[PDB]
């Protein structure tokens, strides 16, 4: 149990040899990323998201789960500027990877994170009348993996999946 004054303190902890630390470091970042827009911006300024997305692919499962929560929270309370930054880092593919996992909770987290990115595309379409993130999700095999979830056991997942397809794709 411990506190930190500086934010780049954690950047060191996320690149440690011990998984047990990295996991809990990611869990802490997700609490910060759950906060307001300035708190999200702090994490962006400390260059933390680049290593989170690297973790979200390469790290072992228990760590990825917390790294996923962190990124989805960013997309939830983040500004259009901040979300575009995450997409530019290439967070869509890492999220689409999680869609096929066994844990229902982690699937919903991925679906929310993708939905947040897709709903931003609705605004961007008004501002070439097309959603730019539809193409990126399809190219990351996300479209098909969402299609799979339409036949999923859990009610909360299969309704979300059907909604995303009808609203943004089909």
């Amino acid at each position: 149990i411990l506190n930190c004054s500086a934010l780049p303190c954690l950047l060191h902890l996320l690149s440690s040899p011990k998984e047990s630390i990295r996991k809990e470091a990611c869990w802490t970042v997700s609490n910060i990323t759950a906060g307001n827009r300035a708190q999200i911006q702090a994490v962006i300024d400390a260059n933390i998201f680049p290593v989170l997305i690297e973790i979200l692919q390469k790290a072992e499962f228990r760590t990825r789960k917390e790294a996923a929560w962190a990124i989805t929270n960013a997309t939830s309370g983040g500004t259009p500027e901040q979300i575009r930054y995450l997409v530019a880092l290439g967070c869509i593919k890492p999220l689409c990877d999680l869609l096929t996992v066994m844990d229902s909770k982690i699937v919903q987290v991925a679906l929310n994170g993708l939905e947040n990115i897709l709903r931003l595309g609705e605004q961007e379409s008004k501002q070439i009348g097309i959603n730019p993130y539809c193409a990126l999700i399809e190219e990351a095999y996300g479209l098909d993996k969402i299609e799979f979830l339409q036949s999923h056991e859990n009610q909360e997942i299969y309704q979300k999946a059907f909604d995303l397809i009808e609203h943004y794709f089909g």
């Binding site: 072992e60 228990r62 999680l98 096929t100 095999y141 299609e147 799979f148 036949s151």
Partner: protein, 216 residues
């Protein structure tokens, strides 16, 4: 022209016909004869409603039978997992062109994750990749994996190999040969089900010997 039509029909359709013994499955031009044999027992072992005092199989796989977070699936699921594993093992491990890997990956993910008999392939880059060479490649590598499974010996206390593990980014498939048949099980990639204190989730089922013995 015609090639695509056939290749799609074969790869994107997991046909299942109900029969007296169990099911007749047809996919990628391959027939399978799936059966109920063993599933009766498999349920009694988990819930712990059996006649004898103990069970050797129940003791060897406590992360399945004595795990409250584990659940039993049908033999059809077992077949799909093996097929998905065959693709994942023989093919995706080597370094080949990325659109081909994504195609095989999608197909194994469809087999492994869903129970749907049709696969509406919406990813376009893959959809163009679907060739007869691709189908041919899958077919041979399914047969290789089946022969590889047939080479397993029943669980023993010698050095004889009795199981096969396939670790993906998001999954761990383990297929072990027992007296009942092939015990197929799917865990998280960190094998959280093995954690004796707080056990993680695991789906599992049985594929009876007969289904594979047709190929050997």
């Amino acid at each position: 022209d015609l090639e695509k039509g056939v290749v799609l029909s074969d790869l994107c359709n997991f046909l299942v016909s109900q029969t007296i013994q169990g099911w007749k499955v047809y996919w990628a031009g391959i027939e399978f004869d799936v059966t109920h044999k063993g599933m009766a027992l498999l349920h009694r072992l988990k819930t712990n409603d059996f006649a004898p005092a103990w069970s050797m199989t129940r003791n060897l796989f406590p992360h399945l039978f004595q795990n409250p977070n584990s659940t039993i699936e049908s033999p059809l699921w077992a077949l799909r997992v093996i097929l998905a594993a065959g693709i994942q093992d023989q093919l995706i491990d080597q370094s080949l062109i990325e659109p081909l890997a994504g195609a095989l990956g999608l197909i194994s993910d469809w087999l492994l994750t869903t129970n749907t008999n049709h696969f509406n392939m919406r990813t376009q880059r893959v959809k163009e990749q679907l060739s007869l060479k691709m189908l041919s490649l899958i077919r041979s590598n399914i047969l290789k994996f089946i022969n590889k499974l047939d080479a397993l010996h029943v669980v023993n206390y010698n050095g004889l190999l009795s199981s096969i593990e396939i670790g993906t980014q998001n999954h761990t498939i383990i297929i072990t040969r027992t007296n009942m048949g092939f015990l197929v099980e799917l865990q998280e990639p960190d094998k959280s089900a093995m954690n004796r204190m707080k056990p993680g989730p695991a789906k599992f089922s049985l594929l009876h010997e007969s289904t594979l013995k047709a190929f050997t």
